[PDB]
Amino acid sequence: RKTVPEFLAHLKSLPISKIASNDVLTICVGNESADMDSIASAITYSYCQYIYNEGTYSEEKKKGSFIVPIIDIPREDLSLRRDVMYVLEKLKIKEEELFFIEDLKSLKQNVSQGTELNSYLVDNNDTPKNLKNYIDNVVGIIDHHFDLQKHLDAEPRIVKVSGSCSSLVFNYWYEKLQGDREVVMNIAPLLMGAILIDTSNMRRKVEESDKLAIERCQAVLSGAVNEVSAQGLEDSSEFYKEIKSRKNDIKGFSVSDILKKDYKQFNFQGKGHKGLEIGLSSIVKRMSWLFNEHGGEADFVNQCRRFQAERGLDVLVLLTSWRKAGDSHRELVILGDSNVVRELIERVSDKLQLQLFGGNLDGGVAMFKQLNVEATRKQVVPYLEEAYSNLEE
């Protein structure tokens, strides 16, 4: 049985007609942000399906084509996720063994012309917008984000609370594989990379799914022992510190890089039939740090406006978060048409406890301390959707 890198290399070595079956090519893709969770989840789903299909858990229930895991960014952008690069290096997964947007385009182009391209979704529950023209059918979903209630016939269809999607993927496959210890060993570093970064080392956003996934990994990684030592948890701590420091490291990146490396885009519907195109960048350093590293406030804001225009956005929002002295802090910066941004912010400012520190809503660029440190992009987006629905048009 192949390890994860061996499986990926094997996929790369095959003709596309041996990956597709009866003129269906099946993939598994995460979300447009391509974070640790999206990448770990997609690779894990694809790998577990492969092991399941060739083994004896799937005796008298046959079938089962290969699933190509896709990371939904240009290959070159992987390097902006220094945490992910570290986890892959540790499992000896080479970038040339992975499949990015370019690879998915090559597959679509080189497959026979009547082949359907179907997708499992992990770490999202509707198809990333940029892939809507490539994916014919959604066949299955496992996710932990707000349920959009689409593709209700998907199999599986798991959209449940979880610190990490990777926990849900792992647990689903663990049951189907009857706890196969070799599989657990082979995926645990990648899985733990996602779970630990998502839960800040099992201290935040922890759900029953995460606790169970961690318990299963510990049981395998410890093996038969008389006494459980502190070593396993110490090793998880050192691993977490390595990944966290790297996620927190955006030194040397351009403003464009920083804005695009953890980014999501939406079209909100309002009272007008025209929607609001809005992008949200999640960033790991405070605005003052960003300004100092990028030629000062004015230079930085100009680069933001450039990014906005390039992505065709009515509104660009930056959400920063950091920790110092055991205290969490957040900021929210918004750029867009003065009319719309003032109305949006005025409608969410109480809930997010926003305090202006820069700019002016009448000017279309404004910067706020966000004293509601619990609200992440996952909450900010619904708050802004609700605000936008109340605007006159």
Nearer to Mg ion, 167 or 308 (CB): 167
Q: Which of 72, 123, 210, 314 binds Mg ion (CB under 5 A)?
A: 123
The least distance separating Mg ion from the CB of residue 35, rounded to whole angstroms, comes to: 7
The least distance separating Mg ion from the CB of residue 157, rounded to whole angstroms, comes to: 17
Nearer to Mg ion, 37 or 97 (CB): 37
The least distance separating Mg ion from the CB of residue 225, rounded to whole angstroms, comes to: 32
Q: Is 72 in the site for Mg ion (CB under 5 A)?
A: no
The least distance separating Mg ion from the CB of residue 41, rounded to whole angstroms, comes to: 7
Name the one range near Mg ion by CB under 5 A: 8-16, 89-97, 122-130, 244-252.
Answer: 122-130
The least distance separating Mg ion from the CB of residue 58, rounded to whole angstroms, comes to: 28
On whether the CB atoms of residues 199 and 191 are closer than 8 A, the answer is no
- The DSSP-derived string for 102-151 is HHHHHHHHHS-TT-EEEEEEES-SS--GGGTTT--EEEEEEE-S------
Which residue is at the shortest CB distance from Mg ion?
37
Q: Is 83 in the site for Mg ion (CB under 5 A)?
A: no
- Tell me how crowded residue 64 is: count the other CB atoms within 10 A of its CB: 14
What is the chain's percent helix, strand, coil content, to nearest 5? Answer: 45, 20, 35
Name the one range near Mg ion by CB under 5 A: 87-95, 116-124, 224-232, 247-255.
Answer: 116-124
Structure tokens at 40: 């770990």
82 labelled binding-site residue: no
Nearer to Mg ion, 42 or 367 (CB): 42
E strands in the chain: 24-29, 68-70, 116-122, 137-143, 157-159, 263-268, 276-283, 315-324, 327-336, 354-360, 365-370
Q: How many residues does the chain have?
A: 393
Give the span between the Cα atoms of 360 and 303, in whole angstroms.
Answer: 18
Give the span between the Cα atoms of 201 and 234, in whole angstroms.
Answer: 11
Q: Is 37 in the site for Mg ion (CB under 5 A)?
A: yes
37 labelled binding-site residue: yes
Q: Which of 71, 101, 165, 334 binds Mg ion (CB under 5 A)?
A: 165
The least distance separating Mg ion from the CB of residue 123, rounded to whole angstroms, comes to: 4
Question: Which residues does a chain break follow in the chain (C to N more than 2.5 Å)?
Answer: none
**By the criterion CB under 5 A, which residues form the site for Mg ion?**
37, 123, 165
Binding positions for Mn(2+)? 37, 123, 144
Binding residue ranges for Mg(2+): 37, 123, 144
